[PDB]
Design a protein around this ligand. Structure first.
Ligand code: CL
Ligand code: MN
Ligand code: MN
Length: 129
């Protein structure tokens, strides 16, 4: 599923991401925009042989099992394919673990490089929330 901006904002709010670990909703929308272009089916292979999955591009070395990443830790205890669903619940639940891991949202390279320090409230402007 390719989400609209306000549609995703609303879904992320329903799932408890607004101000989760101090990160306002706009941060999460911005991260999703630049990680996946709001597409739940996005996948991208990394140089280390791992793959990133879904709307928040969650990595198979640490967080999910894709059956082809040796030494995967699977810390979210899910198949990576579950992160490609039109229902964002699994992605959100796993993202909550990731952002709690010590480095906050810096775990998402696109967030650090494209969202951090910007007017992230713009990403939810105009939305009925
Ligand atoms: Cl933080
Ligand atoms: Mn990425
Ligand atoms: Mn990545």
């Amino acid at each position: 599923k390719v989400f609209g901006r306000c549609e995703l904002a609303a879904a992320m709010k329903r799932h408890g991401l607004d101000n989760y670990r101090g990160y306002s909703l706009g941060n999460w929308v911005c991260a999703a925009k630049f990680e996946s272009n709001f597409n739940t089916q996005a996948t991208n292979r990394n140089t280390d042989g791992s793959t990133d999955y879904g709307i928040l591009q969650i990595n198979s070395r640490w967080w999910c099992n894709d059956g082809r990443t040796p030494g995967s830790r699977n810390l979210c205890n899910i198949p990576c394919s579950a992160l490609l669903s039109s229902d964002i619940t699994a992605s959100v639940n796993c993202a909550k673990k990731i952002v709690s891991d010590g480095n906050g949202m810096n775990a998402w390279v696109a967030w650090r490089n494209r969202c951090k320090g910007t007017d992230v409230q713009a990403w939810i402007r105009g939305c009925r929330l």
